[PDB]
Amino acid sequence: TDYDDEEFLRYLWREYLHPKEYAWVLIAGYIIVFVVALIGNVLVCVAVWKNHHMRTVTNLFIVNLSLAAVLVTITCLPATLVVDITETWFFGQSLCKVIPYLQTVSVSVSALTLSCIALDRWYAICHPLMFKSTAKRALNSIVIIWIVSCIIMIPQAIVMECSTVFPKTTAFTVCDERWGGEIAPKMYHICFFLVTYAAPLCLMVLLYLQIFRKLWCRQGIDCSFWNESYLTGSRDERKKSLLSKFGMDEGVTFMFIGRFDRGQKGVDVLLKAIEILSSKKEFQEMRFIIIGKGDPELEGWARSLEEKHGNVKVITEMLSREFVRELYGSVDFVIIPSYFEPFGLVALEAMCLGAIPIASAVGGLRDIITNETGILVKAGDPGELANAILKALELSRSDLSKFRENCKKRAMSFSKQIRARRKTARMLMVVVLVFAICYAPISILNVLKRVFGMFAHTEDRETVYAWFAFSHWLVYANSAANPIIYNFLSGKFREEFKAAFSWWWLGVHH
């Protein structure tokens, strides 16, 4: 008649010493999370492996984010519910090593996968080469993440130990970390806080802040304002009216709008090109509007060409938003001879209103301007810009209306891409924020406990064990939350969630 088999009876003989009866609010909260995390995360894998349009690098990682969340929801979640209520280990020495090893590996996989998503997004949106990763490269990085996590969390499995604690007189079994010397655990739990929480979050905040700044602000094209409908009449009716205001008659109009910079916007390239062209009879067919302020030398050069030629006009005063809109929907060509332009907001603004851009083949403008929607040249070459202004005149003897419609369709198509990339970043950023808030209490509490040595001398252990149990539930709640973020913030996931639910209950879609 051996009593080694029964640990639950020994817990009943001690149950009176530490009652809680907030156990029902924790059991209810653990069941709710268990169902939502298991249903939601499996739907994530299914929705990606069903639809081949969904197999993007961002989503393949998101599946590897749900694979680790299903692993803990099954193996680690029920064991945490029992321990945080009974304060006893009922699962034996072998599972005292495996279960905590499975949740440290899962926390490492989750931090490194979220960092690779930010990394992949930054190399695709911010890096000047605009890298386009493949599904093969995303799966090999996924394999490596699991290999790395399984190695770096091996010391945790060695350290866990299941021991019977004798001090009323009825002993009970517990599973905890057991280190030799109080010097190694403080070193390790610093390295755990860094690799799993601190270092990834600082990396992702720095990568997503550059992604937010580019997509929201630097590429923030307001299509509600830069629109064709705000104009009146036909384009040649607006052009000749505009020229007559500056004392010019009809002619192919060229427009520059930008600061007079020494190295950047490139008005010095345009000023050099006008002097090249000024020696030709084709010059008197052209009209130039140079709008800008800045370097005093280039100003004097622009006012010197303005005095000499009657088809050059320089505007140095501050222009209203609607005024630049009137120019874009009037002039024939807009010249952007930039040395450095990583966003090309001027091109999107001008093409949306019909202007045909003659721009440098630099990153922001090279992406937007194609072979059928404008003319590209070398950034620092005034002679190649002079040739392009001659080609724009030759083309302007025919009807340019076909090119204007291509420009409007290309700038709108490019704004759709920005708006699509924006929604994906906003969704990923919420996931990160929710990851930060969910792991914040348990990461801080384990640093204060294991490194700083807090909670050792207790004033009241109820509040400390309550905060510990609450923070532990929040970690599994993060696995419940992410599929809800995908449903609220991604239309591709939302419809695929509805199609998998309709098949599962009704069989109505498939």
Ligand X SMILES: CCCCCCCC/C=C\CCCCCCCC(=O)O
Ligand Y SMILES: COc1cc(N2C(=O)N(Cc3c(F)cc(F)cc3F)c3ncccc3S2(=O)=O)cnc1OC
Q: Distance (Å, rounded) from C-alpha 41 to C-alpha 433?
A: 19
Q: What is the closest distance, in whole angstroms, from the C-beta atom of residue 73 to ligand Y in the complex?
A: 12
Among 39, 139, 148, 412, interactor with ligand X by CB under 6 A: 148
Q: Distance (Å, rounded) from C-alpha 347 to C-alpha 339?
A: 15
Q: Distance (Å, rounded) from C-alpha 367 to C-alpha 369?
A: 6
Asked if 29 is part of the footprint of ligand X (rule: CB under 6 A), the reply reads: yes
Point out which span in 73-81, 153-161, 405-413, 432-440 binds ligand X (CB under 6 A): 153-161
- Which SS3 state, helix, strand or coil, does residue 476 take? helix
Q: With residue 49 as reference, give the H or E element that holds it.
A: helix 23-50
Q: Beta 286-291 vs 252-257: how paired, if at all?
A: parallel
Among 470, 489, 494, 503, interactor with ligand X by CB under 6 A: 470
Which of ligand Y, ligand X, none does residue 148 bind (CB under 5 to 8 Å by kind)? ligand X
Point out which span in 45-53, 143-151, 172-180, 353-361 binds ligand X (CB under 6 A): 143-151
Which of ligand Y, ligand X, none does residue 345 bind (CB under 5 to 8 Å by kind)? none
Which residue, 464, 251, 242, is CA-closest to 353? 242
Where along the sequence are the contacts to ligand Y (CB under 6 A)?
A: 76, 79-80, 83, 99-100, 103-104, 107, 156, 175, 192, 196-197, 439, 442-443, 446, 475
Is position 446 annotated in a ligand binding site?
yes
Q: Distance (Å, rounded) from C-alpha 343 to C-alpha 136?
A: 30
Q: What is the closest distance, in whole angstroms, from the C-beta atom of residue 214 to ligand Y in the complex?
A: 30
Q: Judged by CB under 6 A, how many residues of this single chain contact ligand X?
A: 28
Point out which span in 46-54, 140-148, 315-323, 381-389 binds ligand X (CB under 6 A): 140-148
Torsion angle of the four alpha carbons 449, 160, 90, 38, in this order, in degrees rounded to the nearest 10: 80
Q: Give whichever of 473 and 486 is closer to ligand Y, judged by the CB atom.
A: 473
Residues 339-398 that bind ligand X (CB under 6 A): none
Which residues neighbour 463 within 8 Å (Cβ) at sequence distance 6 or greater? none
Q: What is the closest distance, in whole angstroms, from the C-beta atom of residue 480 to ligand X in the complex?
A: 11
Which residue, 486, 489, 506, is CA-closest to 40? 486
The residue number whose beta carbon is nearest to ligand X equals 29
C-to-N gaps above 2.5 Å in the chain, after residues: 167
Residue 431 in tokens: 């996931």
Residues 161-220 that bind ligand X (CB under 6 A): 191, 195, 206-207
Q: Distance (Å, rounded) from C-alpha 148 to C-alpha 145?
A: 5
Site string for ligand X, 97-136 (x = CB under 6 A): x---x----------x---x--xx------x-----x---
Q: What is the closest distance, in whole angstroms, from the C-beta atom of residue 110 to ligand X in the complex?
A: 12
Q: Give whichever of 113 and 373 is closer to ligand X, judged by the CB atom.
A: 113
CA atoms within 13 A on the CB side of 86: 21
Q: What is the closest distance, in whole angstroms, from the C-beta atom of residue 206 to ligand X in the complex?
A: 5
Point out which span in 21-29, 250-258, 278-286, 413-421 binds ligand X (CB under 6 A): 21-29
**Helical spans, DSSP H, in 318-370:** 321-328, 345-351, 363-368
Q: Distance (Å, rounded) from C-alpha 482 to C-alpha 44?
A: 10
Beta bridge partners of 294: 260
CB atoms within 10 A of CB 318: 7
Q: Distance (Å, rounded) from C-alpha 319 to C-alpha 342?
A: 24
Asked if 448 is part of the footprint of ligand X (rule: CB under 6 A), the reply reads: no
- Residues of each annotated binding site: 446
For ligand X, the binding residues (CB under 6 A) are: 22, 25-26, 28-29, 97, 101, 112, 116, 119-120, 127, 133, 141, 144-145, 148, 152, 154, 157-158, 191, 195, 206-207, 469-470, 473
- Residues of each annotated binding site for suvorexant: 446
